[PDB]
Amino acid sequence: MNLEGLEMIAVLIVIVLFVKLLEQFGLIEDSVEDELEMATVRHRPEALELLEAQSKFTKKELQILYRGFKNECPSGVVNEETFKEIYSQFFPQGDSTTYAHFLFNAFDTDHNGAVSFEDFIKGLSILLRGTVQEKLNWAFNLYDINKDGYITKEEMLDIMKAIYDMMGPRQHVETFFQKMDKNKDGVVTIDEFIESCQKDENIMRSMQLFENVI
Ligand SMILES: [Ca+2]
Ligand SMILES: [Ca+2]
């Protein structure tokens, strides 16, 4: 009955936070490391403290959201249809229905077809306590739209748009994709993905700071 349209709102939050964080990780200017290096002299440590506090609130929201979805409705049957409806009433812009889709299907780590409360309960749990690895693995499936196990500079350029619209342009995708696409062929594999990010000081230092806060 009502719960449906309410579990939804809780679900929509989980996405918004999932982007915020992803962005925070540099997996998407809003990087925690960028934020850190924007500070100065006798402030660096004072900044590190602020960043930590605020990333701790975020942990907590996830914890609450987590324990929520969990012991409260861990079955499964979230329908991408009603979800897309909500995503548009808050994040309209253009083609909003497709973005929601792509952003929604991202919680489908086994490509089981759709998305279940379990997939959120898991996704949530990954950011909340998994390792950088598991986080990067989740982030990857976000870009691997079609879910073939690869990432095409276009799939990455779609997400990019899917976001600029969500918030408030296209060429950045190339330079970012070029970081991931090592063997320079037009496709990026999971291994390729996590190797570039792991050897990227910025995405690292950022993701490092976030999962130490507990
Ligand atoms: Ca792909
Ligand atoms: Ca490649």
CA distance 214 to 203: 19
Q: Please give the helix or strand (H or E) that residue 129 lies within, else none.
A: helix 117-129
200 is in an annotated binding site: no
**In the chain, where the domains are located:** 1-214
Angle, CA 98 vertex, CA 100 and CA 28 arms, to 5°: 60
Beta bridge partners of 152: 187
Measured distance CA(73)–CA(96) in Å, rounded: 27
What is the CA(36)–ligand 2 centre distance, in A?
Answer: 31
Going from the Cα of 37 to the center of ligand 2, the distance in angstroms, rounded, reads: 31
Is 188 in a helix, a strand, or coil?
coil
Which listed ligand is nearest to 188 at the C-alpha? 2
- Tell me the residue type at 196: S
Q: How was this structure determined?
A: X-ray
State this model's resolution in angstroms: 3.0
Q: Is 26:206 a contact under the CB 8 Å cutoff?
A: yes
Which CATH architecture describes the domain 1-214? Orthogonal Bundle (1.10)
Sign for the CA dihedral angle at 195, 200, 205, 207 comes to negative
Centre of ligand 2 to C-alpha 176, Å, is 13
What is the 3-state composition of the chain as percent helix, strand, coil, each rounded to the nearest 5? 70, 0, 30
Q: Which residues touch 177 (CB under 8 Å, ≥6 apart)?
A: 151, 153, 156, 157, 188
Beta bridge partners of 187: 152
